Enzyme design. Structure first.
Site, short mmCIF file in Angstrom:
data_model
loop_
_atom_site.label_atom_id
_atom_site.label_comp_id
_atom_site.label_asym_id
_atom_site.label_seq_id
_atom_site.Cartn_x
_atom_site.Cartn_y
_atom_site.Cartn_z
CB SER A 42 -3.05 9.82 -3.74
OG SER A 42 -1.80 9.67 -3.66
CB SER A 100 -2.24 5.83 -5.77
OG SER A 100 -2.42 7.36 -4.83
CD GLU A 140 2.19 12.73 -4.88
OE1 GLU A 140 2.70 12.49 -4.11
OE2 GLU A 140 1.13 12.36 -5.16
CB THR A 209 -7.77 6.17 -2.11
OG1 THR A 209 -6.60 5.51 -3.01
CG2 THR A 209 -8.74 5.32 -1.96
N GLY A 210 -6.69 8.83 -1.19
CA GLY A 210 -5.74 9.89 -0.80
C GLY A 210 -5.11 9.32 0.57
CB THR A 211 -3.02 7.28 2.20
OG1 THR A 211 -3.92 6.67 1.72
CG2 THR A 211 -3.03 6.83 3.83
C1 LIG Z 1 5.00 11.54 0.86
O1 LIG Z 1 3.90 10.76 0.36
N1 LIG Z 1 3.46 10.22 1.56
C2 LIG Z 1 2.69 9.40 1.06
C3 LIG Z 1 2.07 9.00 -0.21
O2 LIG Z 1 2.78 9.02 -0.93
N2 LIG Z 1 0.78 8.97 -0.36
C4 LIG Z 1 0.13 8.35 -1.46
C5 LIG Z 1 -1.45 8.30 -1.47
O3 LIG Z 1 -2.43 9.17 -1.34
N3 LIG Z 1 -1.43 7.08 -1.84
C6 LIG Z 1 -2.26 5.98 -1.70
C7 LIG Z 1 -3.56 6.65 -1.84
O4 LIG Z 1 -3.97 6.93 -2.80
O5 LIG Z 1 -4.27 6.20 -0.77
C8 LIG Z 1 -1.94 4.81 -1.44
C9 LIG Z 1 -2.60 3.72 -1.53
S1 LIG Z 1 -3.11 2.98 -0.18
C10 LIG Z 1 -2.29 1.57 0.30
N4 LIG Z 1 -2.51 0.45 -0.19
C11 LIG Z 1 -1.85 -0.72 0.12
O6 LIG Z 1 -2.24 -1.48 -0.73
C12 LIG Z 1 -1.33 -0.42 1.16
O7 LIG Z 1 -0.66 -1.57 1.48
N5 LIG Z 1 -1.09 0.37 1.90
N6 LIG Z 1 -1.64 1.68 1.77
C13 LIG Z 1 -1.32 2.72 2.28
C14 LIG Z 1 -0.21 4.43 -0.84
S2 LIG Z 1 0.46 5.86 -0.56
C15 LIG Z 1 0.19 6.93 -1.67
C16 LIG Z 1 2.13 8.40 2.39
C17 LIG Z 1 1.27 7.47 2.42
S3 LIG Z 1 0.89 6.69 3.92
C18 LIG Z 1 1.49 8.19 4.52
N7 LIG Z 1 1.41 8.81 6.08
N8 LIG Z 1 2.26 8.99 3.70
#
Ligand SMILES: CO/N=C(\C(=O)N[C@@H]1C(=O)N2C(C(=O)O)=C(CSc3nc(=O)c(=O)[nH]n3C)CS[C@H]12)c1csc(N)n1
Length: 265
Positions: A42, A100, A140, A209-211
């Site tokens: 992200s 995000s 996405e 952020t990115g996750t």
């Molecule tokens: C196919 O997509 N997969 C994803 C995805 O959509 N990622 C996106 C990304 O970069 N995102 C971000 C962010 O910006 O950090 C986030 C924000 S971080 C976060 N905040 C919370 O309050 C919470 O409870 N949990 N989390 C993780 C979530 S996913 C989205 C994903 C998320 S965890 C994982 N193993 N895959």
């Protein structure tokens, strides 16, 4: 003891960690795996919002773009509730940085490069910042899912930190358009536990952020000391040897930011 302190971090969290901090007139470059490729996830939504800002007058930010519930193919906490109202581009931008939102980024990608040229248009924006390394290839949600070692949908801590250095601190966006971007990332609701937790509270932190899969966890940031001297932190991590469903460790990003705060005392 820089590389010594980050290697421990890698041993303790069983992760690959990437760190880049651009040199300033007062501080030198903090670089750990800075030129290795890490998945955007992200984080791309921040220079993407900049791209839409740069390619359009501010009057474009109030343009109603209309999507469906069928178009929410991913984690879209803001676009989820506007299935009929549509969203002004300025709001998708808002959703893109602060929550995000994925559907925002997919509609922001289309507004920039059309139905099939959004990823390449975004990649070409980074080219125009001098970033010849990063590449967006998928939309996405598939951009969070590329295998490890794959170069697709990847940046480097070096390249994204230099890019982000032109957006908030440099003269890539005009004063007003940059202001809206600096405000959006300073209002973000996702990066509390990453670089924010490692910099003291009288420091000012702005971040995106990115996750993702394979334990991917990123935080790109610009930091402001109590004296106002600014730095740009790029922290990137994955735990590939864990598998697609490996657990991201936010506290990893936290500690790496604590180390860079220690040398920026
Ligand atoms: C196919 O997509 N997969 C994803 C995805 O959509 N990622 C996106 C990304 O970069 N995102 C971000 C962010 O910006 O950090 C986030 C924000 S971080 C976060 N905040 C919370 O309050 C919470 O409870 N949990 N989390 C993780 C979530 S996913 C989205 C994903 C998320 S965890 C994982 N193993 N895959």
């Amino acid at each position: 003891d820089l590389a010594d302190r980050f290697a421990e971090l890698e041993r303790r969290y069983d992760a690959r960690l990437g760190v880049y901090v651009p040199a300033t007139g007062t501080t030198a470059a903090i670089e750990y795996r800075a030129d290795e490729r890490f998945a955007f996830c992200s984080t791309f939504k921040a220079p993407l919002v900049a791209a839409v800002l740069h390619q359009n007058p501010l009057t474009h930010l109030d343009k109603l773009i209309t999507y469906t519930s069928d178009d929410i193919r991913s984690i879209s906490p803001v676009a989820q509730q506007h299935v009929q109202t549509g969203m002004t581009i300025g709001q998708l931008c808002d959703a893109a940085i602060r929550y995000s939102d994925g559907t925002a980024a997919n509609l922001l990608l289309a507004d920039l490069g059309g139905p099939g040229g959004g990823t390449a248009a975004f990649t070409g924006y980074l080219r125009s910042l001098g970033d010849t390394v990063s590449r967006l290839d998928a939309e996405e949600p598939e951009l969070n899912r590329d295998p490890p070692g794959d170069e697709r949908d990847t940046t480097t801590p070096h390249a994204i930190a230099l890019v982000l250095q032109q957006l908030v601190l440099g003269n890539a966006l005009p004063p007003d358009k940059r202001a809206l971007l600096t405000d959006w990332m300073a209002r973000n609701t996702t990066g509390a536990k990453r670089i924010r937790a490692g910099f003291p509270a009288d420091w000012k932190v702005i971040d995106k952020t990115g996750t993702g899969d394979y334990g991917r966890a990123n935080d790109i940031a610009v930091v402001w000391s109590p004296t106002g001297v600014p730095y740009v932190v790029a922290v990137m991590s994955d735990r590939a040897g864990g598998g697609y469903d490996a657990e991201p460790r936010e506290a990893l990003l936290a500690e790496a930011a604590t180390c860079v705060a220690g040398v920026l005392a």
